[PDB]
Amino acid sequence: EEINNRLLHGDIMPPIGLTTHDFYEKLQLNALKFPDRILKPIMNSINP
Amino acid sequence: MKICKACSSCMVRTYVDGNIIFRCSCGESVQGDSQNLLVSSKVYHTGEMEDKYKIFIKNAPFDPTNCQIKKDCPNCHLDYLTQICIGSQKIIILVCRCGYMSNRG
Amino acid sequence: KKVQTALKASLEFNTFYAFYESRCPKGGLHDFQDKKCVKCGLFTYIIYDHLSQPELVHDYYNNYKDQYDKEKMSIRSI
Amino acid sequence: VAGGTNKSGIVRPQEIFSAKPVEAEQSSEMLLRLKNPEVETNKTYAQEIANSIELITFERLILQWHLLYETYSSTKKNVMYPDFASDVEWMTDFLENHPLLQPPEDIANWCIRLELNKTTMILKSISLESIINSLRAKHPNTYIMHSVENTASGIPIIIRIYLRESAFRRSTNTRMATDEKIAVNVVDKLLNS
Ligand SMILES: [Zn+2]
Ligand SMILES: [Zn+2]
Ligand SMILES: [Zn+2]
């Protein structure tokens, strides 16, 4: 959501060689990945 | 282009001794003065120009499928605006039904 | 409140120094010799660090903030 | 799958097994190592060199271009396109700002008017001065005028390139090309610089 907020205020400046659309998509894909912490609730619900 | 006065046909443009001369298939020949000094032209980024979306931006406040945003319109003080994101640079425009439009246009 | 204020300041600095990473305010790309650009006063160890030497981060930014603002507005139009 | 990086269902194996030429490669890449081992340690040095080697043709800096049948004389008021008659205001400034770049005596009746994309000039970090030198170093058979590099939005930067008579003296013995054909061929060369 805060990447979208940066877009609304025009605070997303893409680097050289990337358009704003391509840089925004790159930021969203990176920001929407499960961390390594996701197994902490998973492993607490199971008995290995 | 130049339209023949006599037969209203598309006259053929040629260049003689530093002048643009239009000659028609009916023999009528005229010379352009100022407005015919445009051999060719091209416009780049035609897919994101402001003249592309004029109708769409005008109709955006009434289209019910557009994304709304919780912001106050500075003209009519309506508490919601219509947010659109056009172009490859993702230009954000806020529009309202009263005629307000961000970017001052 | 402190978290959001510090995040605003840090994100603004990060955006400014990511825009002017290879881009040079004096035009073209950076010309780096002796670890310092010659067209501007940029240092190599400031582009990715804004905490170890804050004063040198608060001077370069204070030099081209305005020019940065006009360019940011220009990109977000038409 | 996007253009230039197409590594979708079998394409790259087909590029190898069919021995397709370089012109037919949709996913060609290349790895370059910096000459100085000290430079390769620092990321910023490698970052600016990477942006140094990136094909920015003169075409992609242009929003629109116009080909005009005009000749420029400093004193004589030649005919000019009415929609672009306001260009004369910055032409006088150019003449008084460059006492060495005077218009030649063999300017042909062909003008190319250019309106630079100021947004692309900012994102790619390309100055007006760099563009002028690149075009004047590659096209000696043209005379180039430009407006002032403005930092205020709403006023564009105009590049004006005048074709000299020697542009047609290159090869006009091959009469199968009218002067309109060479001028169109020249602007293609200018844009692909
Ligand atoms: Zn006719
Ligand atoms: Zn309103
Ligand atoms: Zn610099």
- Rg (C-alpha) for chain A, rounded Å, is 16
Long-range contacts of D77-83 (CB under 8 A, 24+ apart): D79/B33, D79/B34, D79/B37, D80/B34, D80/B37, D81/B34, D81/B35, D81/B37, D81/B38, D82/B34, D82/B35
- Residues A26/C18, Cβ–Cβ less than 8 Å: no
- Looking at the complex, report in whole angstroms how far the Cα of residue A24 sits from the nearest Cα belonging to chain B: 9
Residues of B in contact with D180 (CB under 8 A): 15, 39
Residues B44, D138: Cα–Cα separation, whole Å: 23
Rg of chain D over Cα atoms, rounded to whole angstroms, equals 22
| C71: nearest CB among D42, D122, D130 | D122
Degrees to nearest 5, angle at CA B95 with B89 and B100: 125
CB within 8 Å: D67 and B38: yes
Among all chains, which residue has been given the structure tokens 């009415």? D82
Three-state secondary structure readout of chain D? CCCCCCCCCCCHHHHHHCCCCHHHCCCCCCCCCCCCCCHHHCHHHHHHHHHHCCCCCHHHHEEEEEEECCCCCCCCCCCCCHHHHHHHHHHHHHHHHCCCCCCCCCEEEEEEEEEECHHHHHHCCCCHHHHHHHHHHHCCCEEEEECCCCCCCCCCCEEEEEEECHHHHCCCCCCCCCHHHHHHHHHHHHHCC
- Counting Cα atoms < 13 Å in the Cβ hemisphere of D84 gives 24
CB atoms within 10 A of CB D48: 20
Task: Tell me, letter by letter, the H, E, C secondary structure of chain B.
Answer: CCECCCCCCECEEEEECCEEEEECCCCCEEECCCCCCCCEEEECCCCCCCCCCHHHHHHHHHCCCCCEECCCCCCCCCCCEEEEEECCCCEEEEECCCCCECCCC
Measured torsion, CA atoms of residues D48, D52, D58, D60, in degrees rounded to the nearest 10: -50
Maximum distance among all alpha carbons in chain C?
A: 42
The rounded distance, in Å, linking the Cα atoms of C1 and C27 is 38
Contact C77 D129 (CB under 8 A): no
Residues of C near D (Cβ–Cβ under 8 Å) read: 21-24, 27-30, 32, 44, 47-48, 67, 70-71, 73-75, 77-78
The angle formed by the CA atoms of residues D125, C48 and C66, to the nearest 5 degrees, is 50
Look-up: residue for tokens 């150019």?
D94
How many alpha carbons fall within 13 Å on the CB side of residue D169?
9
- Rounded-to-integer distance, Cα D16 and Cα D22, Å: 11
H-helix or E-strand spanning residue C68: helix C65-75
d(C-alpha D193, C-alpha D31), whole Å: 25
- The residue count of chain D comes to 193
CA B60/CA B94 separation, integer angstroms: 10
- Residue D73's region, left for phi above 0, alpha for psi from -120 to 50, else beta, is beta
Query: Which residues share a beta bridge with C23?
Result: C29
Q: Is D59 in contact with D112 (CB distance < 8 Å)?
A: no
Could you give the CA distance from residue B29 to residue B24 in angstroms, rounded to a whole number? 6
| Annotated resolution, angstroms | 2.8
Distances (CA, A) of A6 to A11, B102, C49, D92, D94: 5, 17, 21, 44, 41
User: CA torsion sign, B93 to D124 to B46 to D86?
Assistant: positive
Coil vs helix vs strand at A2: helix
Residue B101 CA to ligand 2 centre (angstroms): 8
Rounded Cα gap, residues B32 and B40, in angstroms: 15
CA distance C41 to B39: 48
> B37 contacts in D (CB within 8 Å)?
68-70, 79-81
Q: Cβ(D46)–Cβ(B21) under 8 Å?
A: no
